[PDB]
Amino acid sequence: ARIAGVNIPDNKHTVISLTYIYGVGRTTAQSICAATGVNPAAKIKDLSDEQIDQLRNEVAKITTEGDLRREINMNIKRLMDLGCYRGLRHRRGLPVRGQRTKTNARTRKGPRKPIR
Amino acid sequence: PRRRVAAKREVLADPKYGSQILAKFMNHVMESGKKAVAERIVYGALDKVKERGKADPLETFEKALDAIAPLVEVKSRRVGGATYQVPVEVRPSRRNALAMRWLVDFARKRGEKSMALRLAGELLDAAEGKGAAVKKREDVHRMAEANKAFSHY
Amino acid sequence: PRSLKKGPFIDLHLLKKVEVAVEKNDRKPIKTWSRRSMILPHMVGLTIAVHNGRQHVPVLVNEDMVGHKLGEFAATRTYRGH
Amino acid sequence: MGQKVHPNGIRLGIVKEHTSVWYADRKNYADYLFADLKVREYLQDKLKSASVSRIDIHRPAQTARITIHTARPGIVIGKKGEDVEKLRQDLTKQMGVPVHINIEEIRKPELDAMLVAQSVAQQLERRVMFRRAMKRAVQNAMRIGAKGIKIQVSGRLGGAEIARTEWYREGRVPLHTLRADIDYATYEAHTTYGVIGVKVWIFKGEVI
Amino acid sequence: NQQIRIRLKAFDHRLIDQSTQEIVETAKRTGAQVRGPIPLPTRKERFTVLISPHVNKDARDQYEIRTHKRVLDIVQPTDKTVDALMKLDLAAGVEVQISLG
Amino acid sequence: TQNYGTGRRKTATARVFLRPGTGKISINNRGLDQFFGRETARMVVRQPLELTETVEKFDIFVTVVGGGVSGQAGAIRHGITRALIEYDETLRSSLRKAGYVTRDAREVERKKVGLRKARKRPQYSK
Amino acid sequence: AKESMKNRELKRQLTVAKYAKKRAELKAIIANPNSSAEERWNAQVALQKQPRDASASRLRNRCRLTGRPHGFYRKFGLSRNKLREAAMRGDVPGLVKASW
RNA sequence: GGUGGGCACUCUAAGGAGACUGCCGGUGACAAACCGGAGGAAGGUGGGGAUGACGUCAAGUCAUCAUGGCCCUUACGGCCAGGGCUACACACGUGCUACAAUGGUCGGUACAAAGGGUUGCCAAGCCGCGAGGUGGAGCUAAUCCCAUAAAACCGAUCGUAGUCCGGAUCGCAGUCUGCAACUCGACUGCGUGAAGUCGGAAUCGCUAGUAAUCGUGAAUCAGAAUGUCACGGUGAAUACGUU
DSSP states (O other): EEEETTTTOSSHHHHHHHHGGGTOOOOHHHHHHHOOOOOOBBBGGSSOHHHHHHHHHHHSSSTHHHHHHHHHHHHHHHHHHTTSSSHHHHHSSSOOOOOOOOSTTTTSSSOOSSOO | OOOOOOOOOHHHHHHOOOOHHHHHHHSSSSTOOHHHHHHHHHHHHHHHHHHOSOOOHHHHHHHHHHHSSOOEEEEESSSSSBBBBEEEOOOOOHEEEEEEHHHHHHHSOOOOOOOGGGHHHHHHHHTOSSSSSHHHHHHHHHTTSTTTTTTOO | OOOOTOOOOOHHHHHHHHHHHHHOOOOOOOEEOTTTTTTOOOOOOOEEEEEEEEEEEEEOOOOOTSBBBGGGGOOOOOOOOO | OOOEEEEEEEGTTTOOOSOOHHHOOOHHHHHHHHHHHHHHHHHHOOOOOSOOOEEEOOOOOOOOOEEEEEHHHHHOOOOSSSSHHHHHHHHHHHTSOOOEEEEEEEEEEGGSSSHHHHHHHHHTTTOOOOHHHHHHHHHHHHTTTTTEEEEEEEEGGGSSSOOOOOEEEOOOOOOSSSSSEEEEEEEEEEEEEEEEEEEEEEEEOOOO | OOOOOEEEEEEEEEHHHHHHHHHHHHHTTTTTTEEOOOOOEEEEEEEEEEESSSSOOTTTEEEEEEEEEOOOOOHHHOOOOOOOTTOOOOSSEEEEEEOOO | OOEEEEEESOEEEEEEEEOOSSSSSSEEOOHHHOOOOOOOHHHHHHHHHHHHHHSSSSEEEEEESSSSSHHHHHHHHHHHHHHHHHHHHHHHHHHTTTTTTOOOOOOOOOOTTTOOOSSOOOOOOO | HHHHHHHHHHHHHHHHHHHHHHHHHHHHHOOSSOOTTTTTHHHHHHHHHHOOOOOOGOOOOOOOOOSSSSSSSSSTTHHHHHHHHHHHHHHHTTOOOOOO
């Protein structure tokens, strides 16, 4: 029900519910469920408490949720104070990995402004 | 303008019911040329129709299409410098085809789980004459019988 | 990026300049056109003037920015805004 | 202007044969072809005085045979076959592979597109009226036995400022029937006011 | 020697066809019989080239070269037949490959 | 004894042998039900032996190569049709009226230069 | 045309062949896992005093007469425009345009 | 088919035959021809392609090339290093991927054509989750490699949710090429998970193996396709009719 401080879905498979945790993907959930023994294809309601605790242990050894968001922000911060090219794109919100930035480039900038 | 006779395509009968009328229904529900996928829908749909009442899923198809196929329809027509929607009778070759049109189109927009039971859902829902495809038939019939003033071709 | 088995790549004329500088402690700017050289762990404290197409931008070496390229700290295009 | 494909190319497998007839696989293929076009450029470079029309290059196994068609073999060949030995020396070092030179006599220079284009272009270099050069050329082919000839010339004709395209055609010039044998050639005349292009079609008959 | 194999390649099928028959003719009448000319699949390399010097991408010419191949296996090659064939002086546009003796 | 026929639909060719037998089929050493997972083609092979009453008359050996799902189905379908015309002569009229002796000449067209595919030309603006 | 690029390309062409067998075997040491450090370092150093024209990546494969660097084909070694005029005249063997 | 063996079949590649309104009926000036049928694989130029009449736009190309005139001659010529051609408050054009269950995921299980390969194709085996590394067979090739086709089918799961749809974006760590992946390559794995739930006026493509959809190969190329060219798989609707 509650893993790493986040309530995962109760009416979904363990391998799919575990993906809700910030830091756990499809492979990590598969990796977690294989290391613990909990079967991927059982809903969360019909797993015993001791198996919830066992699943809770596997996630805790993995960087997840706040500390992963904590970890990410220095990595962005460590760049923008560095003054290099990748940091400068991070402080303006443009293509970081050399995208076209000419026509679309609108994952970053948000929306188009009227006044041209 | 054209002089062509177009082309006369023939449809082979279905392998599970021996009725070419289902062949063009299969021909209508097609998407991206996936013949095998779509025929799984109709037979599963026909099993659902057969399992829920009736005696033969093929005869209620016959019952369904007449309740969908209109007997009249207008077309845009310009004679006196203006558009007159002259109601015209629908030929037998077109009424059944457009009957197969409106069954899938309105069942595709239904809220049921899958098309397998969604065309099937409309099939009995249209056979009794209270479905949206039945509803679409009468408003077309409502489009005519009011523009009856224009009867010149 | 560059393969680990090939090792990281720095121009030897720069490598000569860095090796001379550390044993000299001149602390003077190093004027170079090699923006493509990887950043060694061992010129921390030296300043390097990296060419950006027209001028040599002086860059001060730290430890967090070890491992980058010398060109990442020398902008080559000027926007200034619309 | 782009309406018509090259008349000889459209029939390169029907009634016309390739000038270079040989085989090579990948890289000798690249080198051999470069050798042919250069010496073909060279062959016309030395004997522009001679009436050279077709240069066939046959390459058997590790040997190259050059076939040169001329309307005046007395110039390419020298005193008792002396000059021709001189030419065979600088191809056999330009090509590499040894070269054997075969010279044939073009019986009707007026029935060959190259020399007719050669004659008209060379005459136009002497500021003779473009009109008279073409009329003379077409009747020469017609009287000798050609069944059709069209000659087209373009580009600052007569020293005019605005270029134009004037063409004279006699007899039948199908240019669409693949089976019909068509002789086609182009020459660019370099006058004092620019470049004057000459196009000649010569129809010799149906190939049944 | 033992089942002499030759490999024939030509850009023109007419050139390769006449080349096979003359090899057959030089094979018979010398006390040896031929297996027959095996038609090998034709390989053509394709090249799409644009014909305009500037722009006009839609104006192109499609080109082809035809590679024809034959096997024409030789069975029981007599001694007076083996030395009557490599000294052939023909096939300007065709290449003759000698294999298996 | 055996009766042979060759059928082609799009790019596949079928070699059928109508030796006398009870009713069995053999396509590439596998049966009709196992080789061909779709029952529609299962008629396609067998419609020719249903129109003419020969459903249980031979153990037909078939081999096919090339083509696709329906492409093989038509190629083998054209396979037997010639075989009964080889097996006897009175079924030619019955098979021709059904359009079975005719070889389907429809094939995939050559892609065009300046064209995305067969006849669809790229979207253009005024 | 622009013969100066033709001169540059031939100058590159002479340089790659001159250092071909040195550059190749030096790269072999780098790529060989058996050649460990302190000798692969000698190898990767050995490339960089080469005139930098010995890299085969610096060739543009221009046309053989006109030197055009865009419409090139390795099979004929020629520019696209020089391809069509040579193919049109029957100069190149066996090339007859396609229809199918 | 792997071993003898066979020259039957597919297939391969060369010649031919075959379709020509040839015949029949009707109509039509008795003429052209049209409407159908028989036969036939193909019926009315069977399908596709190449083929573009005299001419028009002083259309484009002096940057493929050539070329008259003009222009520069320590530079408007040449060499080199770095940068830019890839920037980006926006707009327009052309495509790809999506909004999902006619589907995603997992497992099993089939059916093609075409092309490339000796400065090359990188098999078997082994190592690594993976991109890849080692290894070196065989192959100048219908012989060996690229090379596993995918949609489709059969079972399980998901159950209509911005979701087991979507994978743009960012972070970390890598592989390969290349002297050198900062500007400015591709690919991989682990994380994250945007807009997007079918799209206004308006507008475009398509009449049969076509549209629609799914993969495959090649050119350019050290490396770099959603573009170009080419191939096959599954496979339609509609044409009353010319205002």
